[PDB]
Design a protein around this ligand. Structure first.
Ligand SMILES: Nc1nc2c(ncn2[C@@H]2O[C@H](COP(=O)(O)OP(=O)(O)NP(=O)(O)O)[C@@H](O)[C@H]2O)c(=O)[nH]1
Ligand SMILES: [Mg+2]
Ligand SMILES: [Mg+2]
Ligand SMILES: [Mg+2]
Lengths: 323, 327
């Protein structure tokens, strides 16, 4: 088995109503209070609009939830309510339904995001440190609140680059951490899935988010986006092993008594561990530093229990200029 | 427009007589060489008998072609001849007739089939992997020979479960693929019709057969047979949309400039894309694996161009247990 090194017991120390989301009962308002002005984006679970609340003329975001089970809606809503006011966590403002279709929708505060494909190519070293530190504040907060995000990726991190403002959004895959609990491995986007998910290890914890955050750090400093570009869920593990090494993979499997599906033995091959300096070239040298590589090496580890916690990462020398 | 991602130009690179089935000229022998031991079944243009060839004692199957337009007889014969020797394709032994009645018939190798209704209730995980891989060999072969089967379904897959033998049979609807050609959407059997057929998209290709093979895989691992059980061609699409989702369907229609029959507006509704894990329960858990669902997800897709090819499917980890034992 395995347990989180930090915040393991926090949910058991809280009232049951805090984490018993199935018992939560949203109050569904009328979406006709909201004028849908502009399509801001979309995801696997919703279409997202810039909206105006017609009663107070406040600009907001309305995420219309594609059909889905009520237990999943209760989970996302309760998590958002528990995290309301947390540093750099998107604020849930309202839960509404269209009066005719009855389709549910979540109303959030509005952030003027710059699309990451365009933003990431103009970031400086200092900018990357700044935004990674802001994202870490959000993750340490939710982890301290007993919640794993489970879908950390650039599309779920909103950044207003002119106001230096960041919000971690899209808590639809988030889940409460309880020690010993076995979780669904079908979470996160392929490129950001931790090795624990790709080898079907279900007793994971907040450290899954730190893998995803290291994936983002690597893409930002090295400019290879996504950094681990698997062609499918099996090749995803291969892409990781070609960097971290195969002997190190087997050591992790052995430690947690994980049986790797036999099909993997051929496609994995044998790969030495690579020095992170190997990914530096003329197009990214001005974003890479020894301190960035040290932090990266301590996040992208097979063993989830040895990865830095969010708070440990925040104390790393890479962030001294932004503390 | 649309084109097959593989084997698109193959027929143009062959002699015209390869695909110009209209000009094919069969050689019709005497059916008196074959004794008829038992009628096994019958289709729309057929009457099928387990038989023995008197000149060599070999057991065979005699399919008496009912009177159809001669052009469609030449198509099936010419396709069967081109696929002779192909892996897991039923072998055409001869083309025979009666001296005075002129009724044509085809002679095939015999297969001691177990009806899929009994068989599928006793297959193991490895057995499904094994038989689906053998069928993929037949589909990759025929696709590589420029041919779409267009009627893949359990009834046209013969499995000898004792000698572990599989043959893809009934080629009367198969056609030759030529890029840009628009084909009749009235092919396949309702439960195995790809979305392209149900929405009248005629510029389809070999990927049609891959939809049909995903339908078979789904029914074998989940034990919901047929997996998509429509009561007619309209409801067939509704059954698919209840699984793959409606916004996914409209994106596909929008990509290929497909406009729906107005009747669909009242029956399709709104459905989210379902996770394949939703279909697992205690009666099929022993046949489902993460690898099985990964492969299924990549076969049952609206966009025919995005489905895996036969060769791609053969490389999937779901078949790793099958590829290594055959080595
Ligand atoms: N400009 C702006 N865009 C937003 C805001 N919130 C969400 N979006 C856009 O709409 C996208 C979808 O929002 P999200 O909460 O992730 O919905 P989802 O269906 O859960 N997406 P996923 O597939 O990742 O699960 C986001 O990636 C983003 O581009 C916002 O506050 N401001
Ligand atoms: Mg998202
Ligand atoms: Mg989401
Ligand atoms: Mg038939």
């Amino acid at each position: 088995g395995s347990r989180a090194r930090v915040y393991a017991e926090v949910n058991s120390l809280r009232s049951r109503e805090y984490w018993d989301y199935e018992a939560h009962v949203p109050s569904w308002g009328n979406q006709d209070d909201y004028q849908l002005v502009r399509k801001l984006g979309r995801g696997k679970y919703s279409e997202v609009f810039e909206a105006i609340n017609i009663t107070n003329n406040e600009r907001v975001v309305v995420k219309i939830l594609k059909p889905v089970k009520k237990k999943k809606i209760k989970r996302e809503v309760k998590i958002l309510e528990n995290l309301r006011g947390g540093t750099n966590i998107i604020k849930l403002i309202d839960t509404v339904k269209d009066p005719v279709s009855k389709t549910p929708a979540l109303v959030f505060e509005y952030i003027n995001n710059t699309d990451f494909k365009q933003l990431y190519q103009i970031l400086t070293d200092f900018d990357i440190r700044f935004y990674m530190y802001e994202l870490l504040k959000a993750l340490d907060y939710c982890h301290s609140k007993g919640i794993m995000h489970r879908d950390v990726k650039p599309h779920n991190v909103m950044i207003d680059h002119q106001q230096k403002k960041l919000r971690l959004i899209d808590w639809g895959l988030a889940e409460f951490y309880h020690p010993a609990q076995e979780y669904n491995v079908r979470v996160a986007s392929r490129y950001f899935k931790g090795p624990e998910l790709l080898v079907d290890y279900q007793m994971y914890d907040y450290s899954l988010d730190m893998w995803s955050l290291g994936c983002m750090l690597a893409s930002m400093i090295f400019r290879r986006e996504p950094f681990f570009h698997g062609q499918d869920n099996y090749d995803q593990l291969v892409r990781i092993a070609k960097v971290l090494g195969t002997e190190e993979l087997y050591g992790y499997l052995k430690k947690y008594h994980i049986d790797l599906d036999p099909h993997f033995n051929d496609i994995l091959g044998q790969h030495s561990r690579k020095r992170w300096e190997n990914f530096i070239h003329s197009e990214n040298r001005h974003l890479v530093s020894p301190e960035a590589l040290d932090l990266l090496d301590k996040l992208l580890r097979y063993d989830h229990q040895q990865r830095l916690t969010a708070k440990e990462a925040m104390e790393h020398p890479y962030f001294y200029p932004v503390v």
